[PDB]
Amino acid sequence: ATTCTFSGSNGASSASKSKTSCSTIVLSNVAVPSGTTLDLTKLNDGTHVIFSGETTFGYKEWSGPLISVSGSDLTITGASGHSINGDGSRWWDGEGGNGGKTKPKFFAAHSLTNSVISGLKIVNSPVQVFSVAGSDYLTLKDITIDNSDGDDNGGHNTDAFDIGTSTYVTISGATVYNQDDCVAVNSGENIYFSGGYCSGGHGLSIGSVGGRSDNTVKNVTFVDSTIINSDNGVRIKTNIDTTGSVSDVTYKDITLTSIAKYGIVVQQNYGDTSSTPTTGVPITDFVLDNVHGSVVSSGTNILISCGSGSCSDWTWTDVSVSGGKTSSKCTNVPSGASC
Numbered sequence: 001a002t003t004c005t006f007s008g009s010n011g012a013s014s015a016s017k018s019k020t021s022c023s024t025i026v027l028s029n030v031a032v033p034s035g036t037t038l039d040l041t042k043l044n045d046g047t048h049v050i051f052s053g054e055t056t057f058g059y060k061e062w063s064g065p066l067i068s069v070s071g072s073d074l075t076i077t078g079a080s081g082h083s084i085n086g087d088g089s090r091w092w093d094g095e096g097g098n099g100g101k102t103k104p105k106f107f108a109a110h111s112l113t114n115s116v117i118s119g120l121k122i123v124n125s126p127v128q129v130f131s132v133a134g135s136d137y138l139t140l141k142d143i144t145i146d147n148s149d150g151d152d153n154g155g156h157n158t159d160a161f162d163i164g165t166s167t168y169v170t171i172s173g174a175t176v177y178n179q180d181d182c183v184a185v186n187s188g189e190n191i192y193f194s195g196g197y198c199s200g201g202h203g204l205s206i207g208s209v210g211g212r213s214d215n216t217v218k219n220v221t222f223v224d225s226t227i228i229n230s231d232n233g234v235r236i237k238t239n240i241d242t243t244g245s246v247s248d249v250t251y252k253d254i255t256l257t258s259i260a261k262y263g264i265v266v267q268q269n270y271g272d273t274s275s276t277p278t279t280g281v282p283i284t285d286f287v288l289d290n291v292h293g294s295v296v297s298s299g300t301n302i303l304i305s306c307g308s309g310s311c312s313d314w315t316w317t318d319v320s321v322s323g324g325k326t327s328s329k330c331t332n333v334p335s336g337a338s339c
């Protein structure tokens with residue numbers, strides 16, 4: 001059993017070259033050089049990684065990731081008082097991932113099996129924070145993401161959790177202040193989100209689904225969570241002219257507070273809302289249970305833009321969204337639901 005401590009301005013290099021001799025790696029006030037990844041890929045099974053002090057990154061216009069981890073039976077945690085500081089205002093230019101500077105993604109959680117990431121505190125990511133991909137039985141718990149400075153400083157596309165090609169991922173106790181989706185499930189199965197607080201972004205989203213070889217979303221649950229001061233609350237987006245499926249999606253015991261645009265929005269014409277919704281990505285067995293909240297007077301309570309026949313078997317129990325306009329543009333609403 002070995003414990004390895006890496007720190008300072010050359011910590012990232014040493015960690016990379018010695019990671020496989022370390023049972024435990026502690027990362028203390030590591031300053032990652034510009035244009036380079038903190039490469040924690042391919043750790044030995046059972047390795048424990050502890051973030052300590054303040055982790056920082058040199059400035060460069062590149063696409064990331066800033067941190068990358070992969071392997072099995074890993075524990076990665078944060079020590080008391082630590083933070084991982086992206087100092088994103090260096091890149092923030094109002095354009096996020098769409099244009100302006102090239103901005104690096106923060107945390108590649110790829111090819112993780114049976115691992116836990118707990119207690120990390122991330123501050124001011126340049127753009128998206130967690131990219132979860134190709135991972136199985138991953139728990140992300142008590143993660144704090146504070147991009148609140150981005151609200152008035154050009155923060156854009158600062159998604160907290162982007163999930164794809166993953167199964168059995170559990171997210172609990174997340175606290176997010178950001179400017180895009182709190183969660184986006186692009187594809188994946190058996191996803192559980194609970195005890196979350198999402199402020200400032202675009203809601204808890206399924207989507208966008210379709211147009212990739214990975215286009216199935218199944219068995220996802222959002223429960224006991226608050227979405228506040230966000231553009232949308234509950235959201236399902238499927239890409240127009242694409243095929244896939246979304247099934248067994250549940251939102252339960254959700255509080256929506258001061259939603260700006262849409263309390264609940266389901267769009268089967270995502271990508272081109274001037275066109276009629278298409279029917280290639282059926283949304284079935286969608287359940288809302290005890291979902292309550294308020295939309296500002298200028299927003300819309302509920303928008304359902306379904307394709308003909310491509311939305312069915314919805315159950316909406318104890319749902320109440322008020323404060324906003326009732327939409328008159330809803331299409332092909334299933335029997336259990338309403339705008």
Ligand SMILES: *[C@@H]1O[C@H](CO)[C@@H](O[C@@H]2O[C@H](CO)[C@@H](O[C@H]3O[C@H](CO)[C@@H](O)[C@H](O)[C@@H]3O)[C@H](O)[C@H]2NC(C)=O)[C@H](O)[C@H]1NC(C)=O
Binds near residue numbers: 168169190192220
């Ligand atoms: C729909 O997704 C649900 C959430 O992933 C899933 O429930 C989860 O089921 C797994 C079993 O595959 C449970 O996990 C395992 O780990 C615990 C301890 O780590 C063991 O005690 C279990 O025996 C098992 O090995 C999860 O605990 C459970 N998660 C929760 C929050 O319920 C459902 O199984 C999925 N439903 C369908 C029909 O597939």
Ligand SMILES: *[C@H]1O[C@H](CO)[C@@H](O)[C@H](O)[C@@H]1O
Binds near residue numbers: 004026
């Ligand atoms: C690296 O150095 C630190 C001292 O801060 C220890 O915590 C650890 O055991 C390792 O030797």
Ligand SMILES: *[C@H]1O[C@H](CO)[C@@H](O)[C@H](O)[C@@H]1O
Binds near residue numbers: 005
């Ligand atoms: C961080 O800490 C290590 C020892 O833990 C030093 O080797 C390094 O120079 C920096 O002070």
Ligand SMILES: *[C@H]1O[C@H](CO)[C@@H](O)[C@H](O)[C@@H]1O
Binds near residue numbers: 008009010
């Ligand atoms: C990284 O750069 C620092 C800061 O100058 C050094 O002290 C360290 O040993 C490494 O070269």
Ligand SMILES: *[C@H]1O[C@H](CO)[C@@H](O)[C@H](O)[C@@H]1O
Binds near residue numbers: 010
């Ligand atoms: C980063 O720096 C460490 C220590 O200087 C080297 O071992 C590594 O190969 C890379 O140059």
Ligand SMILES: *[C@H]1O[C@H](CO)[C@@H](O)[C@H](O)[C@@H]1O
Binds near residue numbers: 006011013015
């Ligand atoms: C990173 O840390 C290792 C082990 O402390 C050093 O050997 C290397 O020079 C770099 O500073």
Ligand SMILES: *[C@H]1O[C@H](CO)[C@@H](O)[C@H](O)[C@@H]1O
Binds near residue numbers: 013014016017039
């Ligand atoms: C991290 O850095 C070390 C040397 O700096 C490499 O050996 C490793 O492949 C990774 O690039």
Ligand SMILES: *[C@H]1O[C@H](CO)[C@@H](O)[C@H](O)[C@@H]1O
Binds near residue numbers: 004
């Ligand atoms: C990685 O870290 C180990 C442990 O300090 C060194 O022995 C190795 O040379 C590399 O710097």
Ligand SMILES: *[C@H]1O[C@H](CO)[C@@H](O)[C@H](O)[C@@H]1O
Binds near residue numbers: 001019021023024047
């Ligand atoms: C913990 O892990 C390291 C390498 O992963 C071993 O060298 C050590 O003996 C213990 O198994």
Ligand SMILES: *[C@H]1O[C@H](CO)[C@@H](O)[C@H](O)[C@@H]1O
Binds near residue numbers: 023024
């Ligand atoms: C490395 O060291 C830490 C503290 O000793 C452990 O938590 C871990 O299991 C591994 O042995």
Ligand SMILES: *[C@H]1O[C@H](CO)[C@@H](O)[C@H](O)[C@@H]1O
Binds near residue numbers: 060
């Ligand atoms: C990281 O990026 C900065 C800015 O381009 C360079 O100065 C540095 O040498 C490294 O490539």
